[PDB]
Design a protein around this motif. Structure first.
Motif, PDB file in Angstrom:
ATOM      1  N   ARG A  49      28.841 -21.225 -26.596  1.00  0.00           N
ATOM      2  CA  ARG A  49      29.281 -19.973 -25.989  1.00  0.00           C
ATOM      3  C   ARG A  49      30.784 -19.973 -25.726  1.00  0.00           C
ATOM      4  NH1 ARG A  49      24.560 -21.051 -22.044  1.00  0.00           N
ATOM      5  NH2 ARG A  49      25.756 -20.000 -20.392  1.00  0.00           N
ATOM      6  N   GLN A  50      31.516 -20.786 -26.485  1.00  0.00           N
ATOM      7  CA  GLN A  50      32.966 -20.880 -26.342  1.00  0.00           C
ATOM      8  C   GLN A  50      33.660 -19.727 -27.066  1.00  0.00           C
ATOM      9  OE1 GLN A  50      33.368 -24.300 -29.935  1.00  0.00           O
ATOM     10  NE2 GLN A  50      33.996 -24.722 -27.820  1.00  0.00           N
ATOM     11  N   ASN A  90      32.231 -15.367 -24.424  1.00  0.00           N
ATOM     12  CA  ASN A  90      32.303 -15.746 -23.019  1.00  0.00           C
ATOM     13  C   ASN A  90      33.223 -14.839 -22.211  1.00  0.00           C
ATOM     14  OD1 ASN A  90      34.663 -16.695 -24.328  1.00  0.00           O
ATOM     15  ND2 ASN A  90      34.968 -18.252 -22.743  1.00  0.00           N
ATOM     16  N   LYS A  91      33.239 -15.064 -20.900  1.00  0.00           N
ATOM     17  CA  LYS A  91      34.082 -14.282 -20.004  1.00  0.00           C
ATOM     18  C   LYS A  91      35.449 -14.965 -19.941  1.00  0.00           C
ATOM     19  CE  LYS A  91      34.088 -10.577 -17.388  1.00  0.00           C
ATOM     20  NZ  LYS A  91      33.765 -10.725 -15.935  1.00  0.00           N
ATOM     21  N   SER A 113      36.082 -22.936 -14.118  1.00  0.00           N
ATOM     22  CA  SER A 113      36.588 -21.838 -14.934  1.00  0.00           C
ATOM     23  C   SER A 113      37.691 -21.226 -14.076  1.00  0.00           C
ATOM     24  CB  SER A 113      35.502 -20.787 -15.229  1.00  0.00           C
ATOM     25  OG  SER A 113      35.458 -19.764 -14.246  1.00  0.00           O
TER      26      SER A 113
END
Ligand SMILES: Nc1ncnc2c1ncn2[C@@H]1O[C@H](COP(=O)(O)OP(=O)(O)O)[C@@H](O)[C@H]1O
Ligand SMILES: [Mn+2]
Length: 291
Positions: free
Chosen positions: A117-118, A121-122, A195
């Protein structure tokens, strides 16, 4: 507000007549010891493999950790019941694939899900690892430059976090942290998932012997208090009742997850020790109510 879930599991250690009996008819979450009947969320007999135990007990948490929720897996019980083995507190490299504990398995599911999910993603996710130790009610940062100097008013967050990019890194800090370790010694290796906007922790607690012969199980008992306090909003949560509940203060909040792994001996001679462990478990399940 209260925790999202408080789970309690028990695992029987290898035999060397077992006092631990798993009824021929049960939901698989029960066990009998000395004529008493215990009921938990999980009951792993000595024949259960690391993989199975992890898949059932921790795997689910990887998702919560990734969605931003704080998670804690805590192992407690008599010395020699498989606590360190279970949480994987030994350097992975020297351990056989089937015997790798929760720590290295969790790190792998984290990496895999972060790499998967790299692109979608957000915002990018960074992974670190901290290694703290509580010796005689005194926190010690085993990854810092002074792995023998207590902390105060800054042990919760302040605790060197070393980068994690592969099992090799996990091995390094586990090797380092161990060499810096000197009547009870508890270990807390936290997998930090940082993050730009969120910080979630996966606290892998490997407490020291719970046997005997403020007490010895102040940490454990303190957790129950802390839990019951949130389920009723006591306005003042006893986070300082013990170093354990202080260092895990940021993880003992609303929506956070907590899981207990009660390791027990199947030997007759440890009957009393095994019962104490199980009894506490019941209390933890009781306080776990309302959550
Ligand atoms: N489920 C298991 N499978 C195989 N060996 C085990 C198991 N659990 C415990 N052992 C072995 O028993 C010994 C003590 O385990 P350990 O985790 O160090 O006890 P504790 O950390 O609770 O004091 C170690 O050699 C460990 O490998
Ligand atoms: Mn141990």
């Amino acid at each position: 507000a209260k925790l999202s879930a408080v789970r309690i599991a028990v695992r029987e250690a290898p035999y060397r007549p077992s006092v631990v009996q798993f009824p021929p008819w049960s939901d698989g979450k029960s066990l009998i010891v000395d004529q008493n009947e215990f009921h938990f969320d999980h009951a792993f007999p000595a024949t259960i493999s690391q993989d199975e135990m992890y898949q059932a007990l921790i795997l689910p948490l990887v998702d919560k950790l990734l969605e931003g929720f704080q998670c804690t897996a805590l192992a407690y019980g008599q010395t020699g019941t498989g606590k360190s083995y279970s949480m994987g507190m030994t350097p992975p490299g020297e351990i056989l694939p089937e015997h790798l504990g929760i720590l290295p398995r969790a790190l792998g599911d984290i990496f895999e899900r972060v790499t998967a999910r790299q692109e979608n993603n957000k915002d990018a996710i960074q992974v670190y690892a901290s290694f703290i130790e509580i010796y005689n009610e005194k926190p010690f940062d085993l990854l810092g430059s002074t792995p023998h100097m207590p902390m105060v008013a800054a042990r919760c967050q302040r605790c060197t976090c070393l980068p994690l990019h592969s099992q090799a890194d996990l091995h390094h800090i586990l090797e380092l942290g161990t060499r810096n370790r000197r009547s009870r010694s508890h270990a807390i290796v936290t997998i930090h998932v940082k993050s730009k906007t969120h910080h979630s922790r996966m606290n892998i607690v490997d407490l020291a012997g719970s046997e005997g012969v403020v007490n010895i199980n102040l940490g454990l008992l303190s957790i129950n208090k802390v839990v019951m306090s949130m389920a009723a909003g006591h306005t003042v949560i006893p986070y300082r009742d013990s170093v354990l509940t202080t260092v895990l203060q940021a993880s003992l909040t609303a929506q956070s997850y907590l899981t207990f792994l009660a390791c027990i001996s199947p030997h007759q001679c440890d009957l009393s020790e095994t019962l104490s462990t199980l009894r506490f478990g019941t209390s933890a399940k009781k306080l776990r109510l309302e959550h």
